[PDB]
């Protein structure tokens, strides 16, 4: 009976050489895509802060524009009535 | 003897019915993860867009507010001149 328990065994070697492998593997990918999501949500979050403060200069400019395009319109205004 | 041989044929049946649920977990875990890096990507993406909008209409903005501000200058000199 000993070739059928060598073929047995030799399987069951098979199997857990490739377990262990596949869980090298995968432990591989897993932490590839956790550094990948760590380092998109870091990305996220500064772009964030860059982008709150262009909304602040962009509130200011706006205000700014539109206070000298009234005092345009009031400037060429004084011309005609002169 | 026959209690080695059905001893790891049992093994064999239990390991190769771990090999496929360990594969769909396995699976299930990297797709898990790839939707969360393809979301945070997607929110990195919005921001960056984002900023890029701003950044233009800064760009705009000021060469308004610049041109403006001449004009200004402009209409209350003609007005000391009228």
Redo the contacts between chains.
């Keep these: 009976?000993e070739s059928?328990?060598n073929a047995?065994?030799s399987?069951?070697r098979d199997?857990?050489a490739?377990?262990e492998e596949?869980a090298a593997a995968?432990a591989q990918?897993?932490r590839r895509?956790?550094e990948?999501?760590r380092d998109?949500?870091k990305?996220?979050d500064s772009?964030?802060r860059?982008?709150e403060e262009?909304?602040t200069?962009?509130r200011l400019?706006?205000d700014?524009?539109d206070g000298?395009?009234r005092?345009?319109l009031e400037?060429?205004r004084?011309?005609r009535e002169?």
């Design positions: 009976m059928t328990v047995l065994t399987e069951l199997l857990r490739q377990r596949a995968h990918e897993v895509l956790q990948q999501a998109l949500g990305q996220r772009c964030l860059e982008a262009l909304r200069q962009l400019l706006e700014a524009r000298l395009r005092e345009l400037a060429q004084k011309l002169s």
